[PDB]
Amino acid sequence: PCSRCFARAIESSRDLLHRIKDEVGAPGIVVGVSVDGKEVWSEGLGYADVENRVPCKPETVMRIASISKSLTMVALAKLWEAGKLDLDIPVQHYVPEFPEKEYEGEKVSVTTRLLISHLSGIRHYEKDIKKVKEEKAYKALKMMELYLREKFENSIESLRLFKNDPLFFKPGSQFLYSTFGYTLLAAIVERASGCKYLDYMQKIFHDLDMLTTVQEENEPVIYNRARFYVYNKKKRLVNTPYVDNSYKWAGGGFLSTVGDLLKFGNAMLYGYQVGLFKNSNENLLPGYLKPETMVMMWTPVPNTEMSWDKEGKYAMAWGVVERKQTYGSCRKQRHYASHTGGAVGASSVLLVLPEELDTETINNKVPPRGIIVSIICNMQSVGLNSTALKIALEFDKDRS
Amino acid sequence: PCSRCFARAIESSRDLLHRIKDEVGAPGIVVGVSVDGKEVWSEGLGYADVENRVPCKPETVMRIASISKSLTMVALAKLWEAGKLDLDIPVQHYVPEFPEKEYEGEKVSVTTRLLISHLSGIRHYEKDIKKVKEEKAYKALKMMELYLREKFENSIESLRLFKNDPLFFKPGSQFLYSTFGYTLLAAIVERASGCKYLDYMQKIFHDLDMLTTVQEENEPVIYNRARFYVYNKKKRLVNTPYVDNSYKWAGGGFLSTVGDLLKFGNAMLYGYQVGLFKNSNENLLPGYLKPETMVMMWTPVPNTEMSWDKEGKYAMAWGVVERKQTYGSCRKQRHYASHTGGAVGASSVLLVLPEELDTETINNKVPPRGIIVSIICNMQSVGLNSTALKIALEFDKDRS
Amino acid sequence: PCSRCFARAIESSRDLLHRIKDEVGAPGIVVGVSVDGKEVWSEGLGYADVENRVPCKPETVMRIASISKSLTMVALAKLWEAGKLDLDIPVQHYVPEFPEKEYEGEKVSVTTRLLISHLSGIRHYEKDIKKVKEEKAYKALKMMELYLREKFENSIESLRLFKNDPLFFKPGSQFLYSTFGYTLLAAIVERASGCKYLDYMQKIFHDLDMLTTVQEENEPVIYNRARFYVYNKKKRLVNTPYVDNSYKWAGGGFLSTVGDLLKFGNAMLYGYQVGLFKNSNENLLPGYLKPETMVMMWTPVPNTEMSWDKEGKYAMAWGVVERKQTYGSCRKQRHYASHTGGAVGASSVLLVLPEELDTETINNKVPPRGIIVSIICNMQSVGLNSTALKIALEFDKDRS
Amino acid sequence: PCSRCFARAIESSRDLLHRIKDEVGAPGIVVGVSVDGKEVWSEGLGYADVENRVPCKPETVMRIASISKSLTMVALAKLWEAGKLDLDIPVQHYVPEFPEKEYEGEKVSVTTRLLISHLSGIRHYEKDIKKVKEEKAYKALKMMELYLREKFENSIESLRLFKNDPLFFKPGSQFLYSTFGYTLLAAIVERASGCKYLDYMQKIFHDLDMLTTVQEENEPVIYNRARFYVYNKKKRLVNTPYVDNSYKWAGGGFLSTVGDLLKFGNAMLYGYQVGLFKNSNENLLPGYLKPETMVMMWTPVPNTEMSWDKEGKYAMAWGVVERKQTYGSCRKQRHYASHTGGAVGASSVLLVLPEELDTETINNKVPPRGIIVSIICNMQSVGLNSTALKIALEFDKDRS
Amino acid sequence: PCSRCFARAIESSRDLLHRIKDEVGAPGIVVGVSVDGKEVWSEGLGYADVENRVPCKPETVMRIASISKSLTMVALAKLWEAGKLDLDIPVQHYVPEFPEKEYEGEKVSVTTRLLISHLSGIRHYEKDIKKVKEEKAYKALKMMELYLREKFENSIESLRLFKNDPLFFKPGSQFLYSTFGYTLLAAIVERASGCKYLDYMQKIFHDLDMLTTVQEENEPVIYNRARFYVYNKKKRLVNTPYVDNSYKWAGGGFLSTVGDLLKFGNAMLYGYQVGLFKNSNENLLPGYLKPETMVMMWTPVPNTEMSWDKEGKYAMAWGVVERKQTYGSCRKQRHYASHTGGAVGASSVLLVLPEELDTETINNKVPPRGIIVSIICNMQSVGLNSTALKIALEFDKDRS
Q: DSSP string spanning E70-133?
């Protein structure tokens, strides 16, 4: 009966996946979805490796990009729950190597909270400050290094790329997406925890049963590793140039499968929703994080912009769209959290759709309720947020 | 046993089709192959219409381009066999509307034979004579209107586009591929036969059992008609702009399926090979064209260039590669004839691979022997000659 | 009957291949053999790609190394037959960019013949002249950059690596294997022919029917491309680090399959043996190279050393062992030519075993007679010369 | 139907075996698995003897190492059930030859229970106490003779190697893996039982139907005996030097096949699970050991470390991982027992995966339920625990 | 198995029926097909009566038009077999009421054979002889009353409409389709047989089991009688004006269902094919008509034109296309007989597709072999010949 009921939504999801794959022309794509904490459908299309004629499989491993930032935020929250990390203390307390910076001749300080929400003013890959300022001013008026090859031994050495770069804007003033901030966050994690960042992340993965997740390293052998392709100026499929992501481990230097992302999403959803089911049953296992911490996360922050959805705002390393209803019989906004990551030669997305719970459902139902959708692709510059949202809505509607 | 033996080559052909489709990113592709005058495999991949989710089928209808030129040449040969057409007589005898032209102040004349081999010097879509001359000179040194919307009532009116254009080169001097020459050939056919060109072509199709072949007209309903797509500057799939091909009926204004192309190729092969099996059996039916005419066709012409194969030369509206062997244990050139046609939003190819016959095979075998491969695609600027050649070679090798 | 007779030697060859694979521990290996100009056996063992579980196939593509030097020598001989190249003229005539060099304050000149036999004194990857001199002196007494990543646009720019390096020894005095000499030879070929080296090599491959042979480039897609593996300090299989071979195109920057190597060997054997069968039949096709040129090649040069066989001497870009018989009932030396190439993460070998022809065999036999053996492996530092010789001897013995 | 259902998991297990064999480069490997007390799959890969070209077979005999310790523990438990052995009595009661030892000038005693769990402080092959202490201290801070040739006539004489060696740590204080402790245990068994250790072990094997199990002796003929290989400094396969294991009979001086290990595991599982099925049926045969004794075994001991799995603890001569579940939707720990043994030139593993039984399954099912996996290899320093666990999980999932 | 095999062709036939119905816009359509003398599929689409919302059914009764002419020819053949009718005798022998006519002042006579093939020159509904002559002359050069309301008591009185009309052309000279000739034929039948035409036709229907066939009369009640519709000048569906067909009983004044037409076609096919199966079995029942008479029928007559198929010729009240094959691998003409009838407000078609029989099929097969297709529509001016031919070809191809 579970599969019999879940026989129409799977077809529509497969049709949407074919539609987006044909629209973008990607060689292959893998989709994985979990319903109420239980995986119900996993499928792959196309070829993981065009040269060797390797078909896509649910066990295929690809890049995840911003999922690394999400996991870094999870590690930061775990450290903060232990009291070893303090958010508003200036970063120079933990990392004296970072020099003190002044904006417009004024003494300013940057905190971990500003770094999480990309409000510290740390520059992005773009170097010309004038171009960035002009673009931001134009956007405001309208509203009113990537291919590096060097390998970095330690996270501290990675700071050399941007330690001397002056701040583009005043801290906590303007939203500016950046990735070096997460490198600084990884350095903070290493300093506070006293252990290597990779070891801590591996321990977290083992605790979360995310076995297949691992960093990007060329020398070690990694099974079911796929390839990445781009279209050239002649509209012909070519291979992605080889790059090194040793300095972007917290900012996108990770690989994983759909199952690990589904497990991570289910764990996050359980941690969020456990704080409400406690009054109904005391036999439920405690969540991975305290409910207060989960409420602190996924909370929209003012003056932040959600790039892949204009209706939402940037939460703590997440994109959250709040429930909204303004006029009668008009558009009803749904509550969901998602993050889109785009690396070179690949694209990915992870979406969480919590269920709306009344006072009667929680009486005789398990705490983890919702839909988790994960889609990974081996083509760069692909937007999969809308497709994931549509698939999640279809599954929610078809849930018997 | 026939299908059991033809179980390995089909898999390899399908793999090659998938490879080329993924390399070019075409939404859909259809393949049709005939062995020894009998169709053995037809298959389609992708979606004929992305918007309406229509899968590709062997009955799908797409543009054919240069197959129209091939059929026009067939009609010209049929008229010439009846004695109503004379090749070397100047075209002004049949079409007085075409003005006499002089090159470098010298009286020159153009014949149908020059028009067939693209040696008359008639300009192509390019208008600047200086650019064409510079390109041809550069090519020689190295060796050493499309989106028109107007509908044309009659073929005579189509001459207005290029009747006043001066000749780019001396007739019969330099090879220059052009399509208006075939419009002039269609006018010649209408004048000589005394009937409409479309009626004559329809009669030829009915004789050749090519029922699904028809010209491109928007108003009439045509079943299983597909769509055409292009990639924009943002590497996103878009729709092909609407165009009118009333003036390019002989030059690419036709639609057909794989089966009709296979039938046409089989008929041409039978007409070519009937002249040799006559001494073995007098019960064989006569070919559609006389063997002498078939020998006159498919004969390479000097000073002509085969664009899609540097090892061949342009025959009479065909691309023929002659059998060649120069050194021992070196490359052995195979004998085959093919023509590649590329229109807006679509691409197609038709290849004929005659079999090598000894004095013993013809004693107890039917006259039509060879492999015919036809591939049609709904993506512009695609080269399918190599894939068709590989598929034909695979079938020839696997022929039990 | 041909396969029935060739049923015992194939088993022994497969057993020897398994033995060497287990002895070295290579993940995969591919073998290809041709008898009397006709391929009789092709087989692959292991996995081409351990990560994606891709089994080895006869169509697998791997590095060839010194086969590139052999092909460069073939191109040089082809140019010399046309009279455009003169061996003993100093290289400064064709390449003025190379500065004149003096040894021990004496004016000396280097010729193409010295470069071919590695007698010009050009340094190898080793930089310390003292160590090289000490090693050579120790060897005489006993007898009595690789991981570069930069891409080079043109062959002329590749000379920057060693244009200012002083000569280690007097030209034509001591044998010293080197690869930059073949880069200089490629520059000479480009200067003399007036065309790009890659275009000339592609034309040669097309003439020789070596379609799958192509240079090493990461961006273009190459089907059936394999991977390369090395053993680390912990005796665990790891991946080979990514390297660029733009400056070693003539010195090992090429990829090919077993079939192309077999075709090249058969062509060379036919060119060698055609000069003797001419008196018996005038219907034989001329060889790819003149018999006098083939006799000039494969001729041992004094003061040269064959690294992989102490019983032979270095010919013109080949390793030739002459027929020898000194005492009665003692070891009888066979005549064969072979070249072993070893790149990073891969190893390969190509062996030619000419047949001994009497005055009676040539009366009623085809000119190309002999055994060609080709073995390619994806493990570095592997010696496959002995295995190839044993397989060739087994096939020669078992030839009914 | 049993084989039809067991058609997918076998393929995955074979693929994993190939993967690990290629990763380590072992010449050969043998796998044997039993499902619910019935053997379902046995297979061998590679060559048992590279020199004589002997392929691996399920009947191949190799070293087992720590399986000897497991069998010694089984014999000790059997003796203890008869009341002839007392655990907490000092060993000097049974073996007066062992001198009394004092730690830090304090009278201390060692018991059989301490010896079983490696808590007696008996030194390992390492002789320098300072190095061992430094290594243990470093490990604690981070957390916060082999090639002997002499033959020993009797187990008592084997004590001469370590009878005078002072204890490294206080008894029952720190975990320290050692093998001489099991030699002392064998001496205890000989003293208490009054018969030879080998005779008692042979009787146990005969009772357990482990016919092929036998000690390592060069003089007697043993059928299907394999060879052992190591990689040298030049990454070339070599032969293992000849060694004598007369003093390590309880510590690794035994040989067996996969079938005997499967039978032993099935017997242990039946003995463990018989104590629960008694209330459902009185017709079941009694287990080889009392259920209370089986519960006493496989019980994790505090302050012990499981070397091959950080998630488990060292039980009585076993490695047991307890079932664990801390957070919701997080990693769920499975309950299993396994032991990994590594000798010179060979490696082996034995894993037991008990099934989770509810109150309904035991009503109509046989007592022995679970999966037993045994893997033996002829390459030293190989970790096969993860592969065995994955194979067992695959079989459990695929169990129809 | 019969229905399982006949599961694909039915779908294609239904699709074609939907296609033609949508193309013409008919309110309803009914199809009936018989395979090898056994009905296999009957279906109706749309509404028989739009006003009363009556869906179309296989039992729906509609007009048949030229099927009345076919039945009249059958009756004439039956009378001729009895010797009571003589073809070449002038009609004045049987019907003295018809005056003798002279063409161009020359004595001419008309026979029943001329009337059957429409060669007697009797005028059609058109009255202006000049227009008819001009149209026929134009057609030759290119190649090189309906709404009457009066009721007629007897067939003799019906001759008053055209008894005084002069002949348009010389008898037996030019083909001219007409319906008054069949009225004269009905008068001939009444005179020769001595009984009423309606009684004879009713007896024939009873013999042929065509129960539902009956003439068009308003007063009597006829069950399942449908309605007829036409499109007005405003492209809106309207009702067909009431008309009387008392004088067109032999020329289209009849109603029937699909089953009766299928039975009639099966009887005709059996009568045609019985003459060949006689030598194989003497137990077969005699056909309704002698085989010689059936051969005389369905025989193309020179100087006759088949209006609905240019590839055929008009036989005796039938349209027969002969088997033809002129060139190799060209169009192969199939042998079939069909007749299309078009009345006011309705259209119908009946097609017979005989099977090709070899010397082996007739040994162990029943005489009636072939496909019968009948389609009736309630929209005027509809051509259903092509659809019926396609359906018959599909059934023939799909016949297991």
A: HHHHHHHHHHHHTTS--SSS-GGGT-TTSPP-EETTEE----HHHHHTT-S----S---HHHHH
A338 is catalytic: no
d(CA D180, CA D183): 5
Phi, psi of E122 (to 5 degrees): -70, 135
List the structure tokens of E117. 């093939």
Distance from C-alpha of E274 to C-alpha of A166, rounded to nearest angstrom: 103
Pick from E68, E70, E184, E171: which is nearest to E114 by CA? E171
Among the listed residues B30, B27, B22, the one whose alpha carbon sits nearest the alpha carbon of residue B239:
B27
Instruction: Give the count of beta carbons closer than 10 Å to the beta carbon of residue B345.
Output: 21
- CA of A24: how far to CAs of A54, A237, C219, E365, in Å? 20, 12, 20, 59
Asked if C218 reaches chain A (Cβ–Cβ under 8 Å), the answer is yes
- How far, rounded to the nearest angstrom, does the alpha carbon of residue A211 sit from its chain's CA centroid? 18
- Give me the residue label for tokens 């034309």: C203
Give the technique used to solve this structure. cryo-EM
DSSP string, D258-303: HHHHHHHHHHHHHHHHHHHHTTT-S-SPPPSS-HHHHHHTT---TT
Confirm if B119 and B112 have CB atoms less than 8 A apart. Answer: no
| φ, ψ at C259 (rounded to 5°) | -65, -40
**From CA D21, how far away is CA D13, in angstroms rounded?**
12
Compute, in degrees rounded to 10, the torsion defined by CA atoms D205, D207, D208, D214: 10
Measured between beta carbons, the chain A residues lying within 8 angstroms of B231 are 25, 231, 235
Pairing of strands E370-377, E346-354: antiparallel
Which residues make beta-bridge pairs with D154?
A: none
Q: Is C204 on the interface with B (CB under 8 A)?
A: no
Helix/strand/coil for D373: strand
> What's the gap between Cα C17 and its chain centre?
21
- Amino acid D187 reads A
- The first and second tokens of residue E343, run together, are 């009345």
CB atoms within 10 A of CB E289: 21
Q: Is B288 on the interface with E (CB under 8 A)?
A: yes
Q: What is residue C152's DSSP assignment?
A: -
C and D interact (at least 3 Cβ pairs within 8 A): yes
Is the CB of residue A51 less than 8 Å from the CB of residue C225? Answer: yes
User: Residue written as tokens 């137990």?
Assistant: E283
Yes or no, beta carbons of B270 and E329 under 8 Å apart: yes
Q: What tokens appear for E321 in the block?
A: 């296309």
Residue recorded with tokens 């060859």:
C13
The alpha-carbon gap from A216 to the nearest alpha carbon of chain D, in Å, equals 19
Active site residues of D: 66
Residue A59 burial (CB count, 10 A): 15
Q: Rounded to the nearest 5°, which phi and psi values hold at E396?
A: -65, -40
| CA pair distance C336, C330, nearest whole angstrom | 19
What does the H/E/C string look like for D195-260? Answer: CCHHHHHHHHHHHCCCCCCEECCCCCCCCCECCCEEECCCCCEEECCCCCCHHHCCCCCEEECHHH
What does the block give as tokens for A257? 């499968």
Neighbouring CB atoms inside 10 A of C84's CB total 13
Measured distance CA(C185)–CA(C192) in Å, rounded: 10
| C-alpha triplet D25, D29, D34: angle, nearest 5° | 145
- Interchain contact, A52 vs C224, CB within 8 Å: yes
Among B300, B229, B256, which residue's Cα sits nearest to residue B68?
B256
Burial per residue of E204-236, b for 16 or more beta-carbon CB atoms within 10 angstroms, e otherwise: bbeebebebbbbbeeeeeeeeebbbbeeeeeee
Resolution number, Å:
3.1
